[PDB]
Amino acid sequence: MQKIKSEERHIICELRCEPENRERVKELVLKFVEPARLETGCLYYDLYQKIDEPDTFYIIDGWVNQEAVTSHAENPHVAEVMSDLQPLLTFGPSISLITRVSD
Amino acid sequence: SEERHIICELRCEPENRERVKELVLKFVEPARLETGCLYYDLYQKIDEPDTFYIIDGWVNQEAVTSHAENPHVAEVMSDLQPLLTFGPSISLITRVSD
């Protein structure tokens, strides 16, 4: 159960854009959602928006293990959406790979 | 929409890494028992272990506010504050979707 916990990999990914591209950025990032959840080792995957700074988005997702999150980062559909997103971003996806300490 | 989620970042000096981890864990079970708590978990950044994140969700604004005002939270925060070099930096966010 502790080997299960420690094997998980979670990701916080921060993205920011200019006010004018807020709707377009939101639309693109949503595309990552359902396909990511269908990836087999995906525990969860959700897009969030900062309440006081709507130009700031966070993607929070969890994976069964390193291999699942790595397979996810290498996914063609992820790269394809990332390609369209990059030019709209003022703060490029800032990724934090983390592990769960709490049971 | 009504939900409120929080990303809370904390950083410490390498030397207090274990002590900071022990204290933050104390927020865990009591937070999960708070009415309106959807989830509450502590994480550590893999490549920078001196950085922790607390990710928690609440049913609504009232629940998260009641949480921020909780005495147990303040007590643990009192012990933690001197061990921290950064934060607790809080980002209040809402789940985007369609």
* Crossing angle between the packed helical segments A22-38 and A76-85, to the nearest 10 degrees: 170
Q: So where are chain B's domains? A: 1-98
| Residue among B15, B17, B6 at smallest CA distance from B90 | B6
Query: Sign of torsion, CA A38 A43 A44 A45?
Result: negative
Cα A48–Cα A11–Cα B77 angle in degrees, nearest 5: 80
Fold assignment, A1-103: Alpha-Beta Plaits (3.30.70)
CA distance A4 to chain B (A): 14
Residue of A nearest to B4 (CA): A51
Angle between helices B71-80 and B17-33 (to 10 degrees): 180
Chain B positions contacting chain A at CB under 8 Å are: 4-5, 7, 21, 24-25, 28, 40-47, 51-53, 55, 91-98
**Alpha carbons A55 and B96: distance in angstroms, whole number:** 12
Residue A43 φ then ψ, to 5°: -85, -45
Best CA proximity match to B21, nearest among A101, A97, A8? A101
Q: How far apart are the first and last CA of chain A?
A: 8
Method in brief? X-ray
CATH class of B1-98: alpha beta
Cβ B46–A101 below 8 Å, yes or no?
no
What whole-number distance in Å separates Cα of residue B72 and Cα of residue B88?
16
Residues of chain B with C-beta less than 8 angstroms from the C-beta of A30: 96-98
Q: Are B45 and A10 within 8 A, CB to CB?
A: no
Across the A/B interface, how many CB contacts are shorter than 8 Å? 69
- What's the per-residue H, E or C state across chain A? CHHHHHHCEEEEEEEEECHHHHHHHHHHHHHHHHHHHHCCCEEEEEEEEECCCCCEEEEEEEECCHHHHHHHHCCHHHHHHHHHHHHHEEEEEEEEEEEECCC
Token representation of residue B88: 């607790």
Distance from the Cα of A76 to chain B's closest Cα (Å) equals: 23
Cβ contact A26:A49 at 8 Å: yes
